[PDB]
Structures are given as structure tokens and as C-alpha cells.
């Protein structure tokens, strides 16, 4: 059919794809620092992390007004991790493991919107 | 004239178009998170926009959003 939650699941597919490029550009920046100017590698990382956290804030806000609380539970723990980084503002091995999980989490949830949206459109 | 389900869809589409235009203007005209909201607001209210997107991937968002606010306003009237 046509519901407000069905349209919210459609905007996520276009927006979550942009969040994929951020975590992919992150592992590239960490790969360059592992091989080795150093200011440009970290200052750019500070500029890319802010939109990634703000865009996900809409994912927790769109589904809140869409009454789809079954999907919100799959995004609340992701937003809680952003509060730890925002509060406090070797490290290479720790941050590397803290970024590979982002690519897997932003991809497994990406397939949900590709299927949960179909579960409402064709189900008219 | 417009159901309450459409008014909730317009606001999130307005912000959704705005955040995409900011992401398009980031991979490369400033078009920050603030100027994109102003340009999209001036385009939805049929007013004269201050600036226009320079890149092709930014011009697509402008032309598509222009067709969106034209159909919605014409349907509301």
C-alpha cells in the first residue's frame, strides 16, 4: 500500500548507502596511517565523522514518527555508541576493530530496508 | 486539502532532499548543511533561489525537487 513508514524505509536506502561510503573511506584512512601530512589524515577524519553520526540520528527519528518500533531497536545501540565518542573528545589496533564492525552493521541493516519496504508496498 | 500523512511525508522529504544535496556538495559552491536548507526552503515556497547547484549530480536534485513542489502546490490549490 502507501504508509508513512513505507516512505521512511525508502529514504533510508538512499541515505544508508551514503553512510556506507563513510565507513569505507575510514578503513582507507586507517590503512594509510598503518603503512606510514599526518594532520591531514586525522583532521579529515574529524570532518567525516560528524555527518555520519548526524545522518544516523535521522534514522532514529524517522522511524520514531513512523510507528516502526521493531526497527528502532536495531538502531538504538548504534546511537548509544556515538554518545561515548561525543563525551570524550595501541589505538590503531583498537580503532581498526571499531571500524570493521561499522561496515558490517551498516550493510546488514541496509538489506532490511531493501526487504522491509517490500513487505509493505506489495502487501496492499 | 492534504491528509496528515502527506504533511509528515513532505517535511522528511524536505530534510531528506536537503541532506542529500549537502552530501553531493561534499564529495567535490559551498552548499553546506545550512545553505542547502535555505535553498530547498526557497524552492518549496516558489520563491527566488539565492544560488543554483553547480555540479550535474547537484543539478539533478534541484530539478527533481522543483518538480516535486510544483505538483504538491498545484494539487493543494
Amino acid at each position: 500500500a502507501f504508509t508513512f513508514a513505507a516512505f521512511c524505509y525508502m529514504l533510508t536506502l538512499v541515505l544508508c548507502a551514503s553512510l556506507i561510503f563513510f565507513v569505507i573511506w575510514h578503513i582507507i584512512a586507517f590503512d594509510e596511517l598503518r603503512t606510514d601530512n599526518i594532520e591531514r589524515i586525522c583532521c579529515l577524519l574529524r570532518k567525516l565523522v560528524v555527518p555520519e553520526y548526524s545522518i544516523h540520528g535521522l534514522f532514529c527519528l524517522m522511524f520514531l514518527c513512523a510507528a516502526e518500533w521493531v526497527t528502532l531497536g536495531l538502531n538504538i545501540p548504534l546511537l548509544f555508541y556515538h554518545l561515548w565518542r561525543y563525551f570524550h573528545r595501541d589505538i590503531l589496533n583498537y580503532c581498526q576493530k571499531e571500524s570493521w564492525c561499522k561496515l558490517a552493521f551498516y550493510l546488514l541493516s541496509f538489506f532490511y530496508y531493501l526487504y522491509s519496504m517490500v513487505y509493505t508496498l506489495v502487501s496492499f | 486539502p492534504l491528509a496528515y500523512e502527506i504533511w509528515m511525508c513532505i517535511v522528511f522529504a524536505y530534510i531528506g532532499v536537503s541532506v542529500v544535496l549537502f552530501l553531493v556538495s561534499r564529495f567535490s559552491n559551498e552548499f553546506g548543511i545550512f545553505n542547502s536548507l535555505w535553498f530547498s526552503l526557497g524552492a518549496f515556497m516558489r520563491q527566488g533561489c539565492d544560488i543554483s547547484p553547480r555540479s550535474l549530480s547537484g543539478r539533478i536534485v534541484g530539478g527533481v525537487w522543483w518538480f516535486f513542489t510544483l505538483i504538491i502546490i498545484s494539487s493543494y490549490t
Partner: peptide
């Protein structure tokens, strides 16, 4: 239909931005 057109335009713009970023 206009919402579908909006979503398709956003997706096409994202793809064109990806292409133009990978062009360099």
C-alpha cells in the same frame, strides 16, 4: 508518483556523484 520520481532522482544523483568522485 512524484515521491517515486523524487526517490529515483536522489538515487541517480548519488550514483552520478559516485561516478564523478571515482573519475578523479
Amino acid at each position: 508518483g512524484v515521491f517515486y520520481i523524487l526517490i529515483g532522482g536522489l538515487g541517480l544523483a548519488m550514483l552520478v556523484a559516485l561516478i564523478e568522485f571515482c573519475y578523479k
